[PDB]
């Protein structure tokens, strides 16, 4: 049956309720960033290196020093509950399974204590959105401490919810016996236009800027990475305010319209961080090439979104854990048919626009 992460997409879309698939599925707008994201990737072409002995090939890396299996780890993606009844927490079995880390939303249907508690031993960082709440953005920050999370990944690109259209016509909202678990009332638990779009716009604060970095910095000592990030200044800022890292993203194309592809910007944002921080990429990774051109163009790893999501809804746990096994495993002869023994090789001769 399914080989690829394509097959797990077209599977989902065979089993999931039409609002829920097109709530994961969709961009913004026109959803032209959401095709670029994919077709962007087949412009890196590469030129493969012959007869260099990848008979034992290393995938391991490192993420803000702590050790991953592969340069391939789960992004955020929210209310996951409604692929697969057990959610976020197949997830992070899965995770732990494959070695490699998970990024939770911060509108996760399962909380922060129950996933640690699903995964002790797994690698699991924040995704922290700034709520005009103070104090509920600081204590989502302290259980991520308490609870063994080693990182913080702060959205900085939703001051406001993108238009997705097809969540409006659909005028999207959780199942009924799903919550965002993080929260305790029943606006910021989003308990059933977009209903996600409104969530935001009563919660998510629009004001935020450098200063409330500022503040997230002062806030806690874990490593924190701005999530969101398209502009060289923007990263140079970053790196100013002592984040430790940036993850060039566009939103899975789901925020602004008409944004490069997050490969055609990662250059620019490597080039302008100067070797200070590490640098990942998220949005339309998919193949085990696509990994390796980001790796070649200068990202320490990168994150997968939806293809996550389509794993729950095939088989839960299992489901997460093929398609991370799948990438894995692409990703390794991808190395190894390029000539690289392990990731420290993979070099920006490999690839041209
Ligand atoms: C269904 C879905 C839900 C998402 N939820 C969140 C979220 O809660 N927080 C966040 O910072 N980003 C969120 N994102 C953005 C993802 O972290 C990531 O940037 C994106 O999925 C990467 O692109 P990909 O789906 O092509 O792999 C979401 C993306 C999708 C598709
Ligand atoms: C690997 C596991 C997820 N089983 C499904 C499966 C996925 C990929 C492949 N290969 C040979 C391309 C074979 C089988």
């Given at each position: 049956r399914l080989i690829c992460i394509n097959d797990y997409e077209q599977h989902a879309k065979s089993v999931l309720p039409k609002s829920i698939y097109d709530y994961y599925r969709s961009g913004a707008n026109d959803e032209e960033t959401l095709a670029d994201n994919?077709?962007?990737?087949?412009?890196?072409?590469?030129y493969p290196r012959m007869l260099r002995n990848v008979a034992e090939t290393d995938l391991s890396t490192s993420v803000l020093g702590?050790?991953?299996?592969?340069?391939?780890c789960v992004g955020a993606t929210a209310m996951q509950r409604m692929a697969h009844v057990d959610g976020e927490l197949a997830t992070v079995r899965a995770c732990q399974s494959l070695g490699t880390g998970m990024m939770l939303s911060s509108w996760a249907t399962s909380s922060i204590e129950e996933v640690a508690e699903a995964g002790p031993e797994?690698?699991?960082?924040?995704?922290?959105?700034?709520?005009?709440?103070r104090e509920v953005t600081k204590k989502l920050v302290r259980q991520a401490e308490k609870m063994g999370y080693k990182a913080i990944f702060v959205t900085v690109d939703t001051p406001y919810l993108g238009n997705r259209l097809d969540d409006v016509r659909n005028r999207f909202k959780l199942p009924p016996q799903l919550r965002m678990k993080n929260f305790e009332t029943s606006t910021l638990s989003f308990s059933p236009?977009?209903?996600?779009?409104?969530?935001?716009?009563?919660?998510?604060?629009?004001?935020?800027?450098?200063?409330?970095?500022?503040?997230?910095?002062?806030?806690?000592?874990?490593?924190?990475?701005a999530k969101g990030i398209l502009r060289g200044d923007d990263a140079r800022e970053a790196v100013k305010h002592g984040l430790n890292g940036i993850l060039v993203s566009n939103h899975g194309a789901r925020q602004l319209d008409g944004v490069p592809a997050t490969?055609?910007?990662?250059?620019?944002?490597?080039?302008?961080?100067?070797?200070?921080?590490?640098?990942?990429?998220?949005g339309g990774v998919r193949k085990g090439t696509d990994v390796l051109k980001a790796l070649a163009l200068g990202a320490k790893a990168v994150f997968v979104g939806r293809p996550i999501v389509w794993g729950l809804a095939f088989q839960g746990e299992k489901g997460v854990q093929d398609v991370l096994e799948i990438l894995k495993e692409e990703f390794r002869l991808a190395?190894?048919?390029?000539?690289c023994q392990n990731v420290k090789v993979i070099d920006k001769t490999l690839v041209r626009k």
């Open positions: 994919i077709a962007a990737f087949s412009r890196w072409k590469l702590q050790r991953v299996s592969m340069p391939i797994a690698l699991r960082w924040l995704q922290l959105y700034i709520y005009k709440d236009d977009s209903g996600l779009a409104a969530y935001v716009a009563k919660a998510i604060d629009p004001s935020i800027s450098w200063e409330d970095i500022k503040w997230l910095r002062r806030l806690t000592s874990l490593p924190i990475v490969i055609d910007v990662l250059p620019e944002i490597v080039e302008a961080v100067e070797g200070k921080v590490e640098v990942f990429l998220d190395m190894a048919l390029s000539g």
